[PDB]
Amino acid sequence: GGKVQIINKKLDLSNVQSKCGSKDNIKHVPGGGSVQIVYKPVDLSKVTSKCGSLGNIHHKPGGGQVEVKSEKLDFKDRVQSKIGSLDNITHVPGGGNKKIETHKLTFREN
Amino acid sequence: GGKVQIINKKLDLSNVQSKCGSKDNIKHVPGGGSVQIVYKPVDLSKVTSKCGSLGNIHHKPGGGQVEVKSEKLDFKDRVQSKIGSLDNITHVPGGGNKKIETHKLTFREN
Amino acid sequence: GGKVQIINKKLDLSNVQSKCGSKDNIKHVPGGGSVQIVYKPVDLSKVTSKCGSLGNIHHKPGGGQVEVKSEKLDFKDRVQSKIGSLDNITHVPGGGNKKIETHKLTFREN
Numbered sequence: 001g002g003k004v005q006i007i008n009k010k011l012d013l014s015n016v017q018s019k020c021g022s023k024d025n026i027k028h029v030p031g032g033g034s035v036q037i038v039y040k041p042v043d044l045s046k047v048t049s050k051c052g053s054l055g056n057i058h059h060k061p062g063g064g065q066v067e068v069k070s071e072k073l074d075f076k077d078r079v080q081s082k083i084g085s086l087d088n089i090t091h092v093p094g095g096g097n098k099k100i101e102t103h104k105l106t107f108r109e110n
Numbered sequence: 111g112g113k114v115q116i117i118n119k120k121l122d123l124s125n126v127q128s129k130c131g132s133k134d135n136i137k138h139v140p141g142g143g144s145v146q147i148v149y150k151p152v153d154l155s156k157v158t159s160k161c162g163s164l165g166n167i168h169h170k171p172g173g174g175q176v177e178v179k180s181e182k183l184d185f186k187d188r189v190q191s192k193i194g195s196l197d198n199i200t201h202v203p204g205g206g207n208k209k210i211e212t213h214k215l216t217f218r219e220n
Numbered sequence: 221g222g223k224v225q226i227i228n229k230k231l232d233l234s235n236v237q238s239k240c241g242s243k244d245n246i247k248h249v250p251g252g253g254s255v256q257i258v259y260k261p262v263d264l265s266k267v268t269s270k271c272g273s274l275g276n277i278h279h280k281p282g283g284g285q286v287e288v289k290s291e292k293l294d295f296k297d298r299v300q301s302k303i304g305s306l307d308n309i310t311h312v313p314g315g316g317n318k319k320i321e322t323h324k325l326t327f328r329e330n
Contacts, residue, residue, distance in 0.1 A: 001111045001279070002112045002221045002222045002223065003221070003223045003224070004113070004114045004224045005113075005114075005223075005224070006117065006226045007226065008231075009230070010119070011118075011120070011122060011228065011231045012232045013123045013161050014124045014126075014161075014233065014234045014235065015125045015161040015235045016126045017126065017128065017130055017157075018128045018239065019242060020127070020130045020159075020237055020240045020241050021130050021132070021155060021157035021242075022131075022239075022241070022242045023133045023134075023136070023155075023242070023244070024132075024133070024242075024244045025134075025135045025244055025245045026135075026246045026247075027136075027139070027217075027246070027247045027249075028139065028140070028248045029249045029251075030251050030257070030259060031143070031147070032142045032213050032215075032252045033142050033143045033198065033213055033251070034251045034253060034254045034257060035191060035255045036257065037144060037146065037147045037149075037250070037251070037257045037259060038187065038258045038260065038297075039140060039147060039148060039250070040150045040152065041151045041152070041261045041262075042151075042154070042261070043153045043155055043263045044262070044263060044264045045263055045264070045266070046156045046158070046265075046267075046268070047158075047237075047241035048159075048267075049240075049268075049269045050159075050160045050161070050235075050269075050271075051161045051235040051271045051273070052123070052163075053161070053270070053273045054163065054164045054274045055165045055274055055276030056165030056168070057165065057276065057278070058171065058276070058279070059111070059170065059279045060280045061168055061170070061278065061281045062172045062282045062283030063172030063173045063283045064172075064173060064174045064175055064176065064284045064285075065175045065288065066177070066281065066283075066284065066287065067166075068179075068287070068290070069288075069289045070178070071180075071181045072181070072182045072183070073292070073294065073295075074182070074183065074184045075183075075185045075260065075295045076187075076294065076296045077186070077297045078188045078298045079187075079190075079297070080190045080191065080299075081191045081300065081301045082191070083191070083302070083304065084194045084195045084304045085304045085305045085306075085307075086197075086255070086307070087195075087196070087309065088198045088253065088309070089201075089307070089311065090199075090309070090312075090320065091200070091309075092200075092314075093203045093314050094202075094203050094204045094314045095205045095315045095316030096204070096205030096208060097206070097316065098202060098208045098210070098318045098319070099210070099318075100202065100210045100320045100321070101211045101212065101324060102200070103212070103213045103253055103323045104211060104213070104214045104215065104216075105249070105323075105326070106325075106326045107326070107327045107328065108217065108330065109219045110219055110330045155241075165276060213252075215249065219245070
C-alpha cells in the first residue's frame with residue numbers, strides 16, 4: 001500500500017485579506033423606451049487565497065465519477081418580435097424658441 | 111492498506127479578513143416605458159480564504175458518484191411580442207419657449 | 221507501493237492581499253429606444269493567490285473520471301424580428317430658433 005506521513009515543527013502561517021471582493025457604486029440602467037430586453041448580467045469572479053493548504057489523499061478511489069466538480073450554466077433564450085410598423089417621429093412645425101432633446105445621454109466624471 | 115499519520119508541534123495559524131464581500135451603493139433602475147424586460151442579474155462571486163486546511167482522506171471510495179459537487183443553473187426564457195404598430199411621436203406645433211426632453215439621462219460623478 | 225513523507229521545521233509563511241477583486245463605478249446603460257437587446261455580460265475573472273500549498277496525493281485513482289473539474293457555459297439564443305416598416309423621421313418645418321438633438325452622447329472625463 002501507500003503510507004503517508006507528515007511532520008511539522010515550529011510553523012508560522014499567516015493569511016491576511018483586506019477590502020477583498022468589495023463592489024461599490026454599480027449602476028444598472030436598462031430600458032430607454034425599448035421593446036424587448038433580455039438583461040442577464042452574470043458574474044463568476046473568484047478571489048481565492050490559500051496558504052499552507054493540503055490537497056486530498058486517496059487510496060484507490062476507483063469507480064464512476066470521483067470528486068468531480070461539475071458546473072453547468074444554461075441561459076438559453078428564445079425572443080420573438082412581430083410588429084406591424086415602427087415610427088420615431090419628432091414633428092416640430094411652426095416657429096419659436098424650441099429645444100428638443102431625445103435620448104440625451106451625458107456622462108461627466110469630473 | 112494505506113496508513114496516514116499527521117504530526118504537528120508548536121504551530122501558529124492566523125486568518126484575517128477585513129471588509130470582505132461588502133457591496134455598497136448598488137442601483138438597479140430598469141424600465142423607461144419599455145414593453146418587455148427580462149431583468150435577471152445573477153452573481154456567483156466567491157471570495158475564499160483558507161489556511162492550514164486539509165483535504166479529505168478516503169480509502170477505496172469506489173462506486174457511482176462520490177463527493178461530486180454538481181451545480182446547475184437553468185434560466186431558459188421564452189418571450190414573445192406581437193404588436194400592431196408602435197409610434198413615438200413628439201408633435202410640437204405652434205410657437206413659444208418650449209424645452210422638450212425625452213429619455214434624458216445625465217450622470218455626474220463629481 | 222509508494223511512500224510519501226514530508227518533514228518541515230521552523231517555517232514562516234505569509235500571504236497578504238489588499239484591495240483585491242474590488243469593482244467600483246460600473247455603469248450598465250443599454251436601451252436607447254431599441255427593439256431587441258440580448259444584454260448578457262459574463263465575467264469569469266479569477267484572482268488566485270497561493271503560498272506553501274500542496275496538491276493532492278493519490279494511490280491508484282483508476283476508473284472513470286477522477287477529480288475532473290468540468291465547467292460548461294451555454295448561452296444559446298434565438299432572436300427573431302419581423303417588422304413591417306421602420307422610420308426615424310425628424311420633420312422640422314417652419315422657421316425659428318430650433319435646436320434638435322437625437323441620441324446625443326457626450327462623455328467628459330475631466
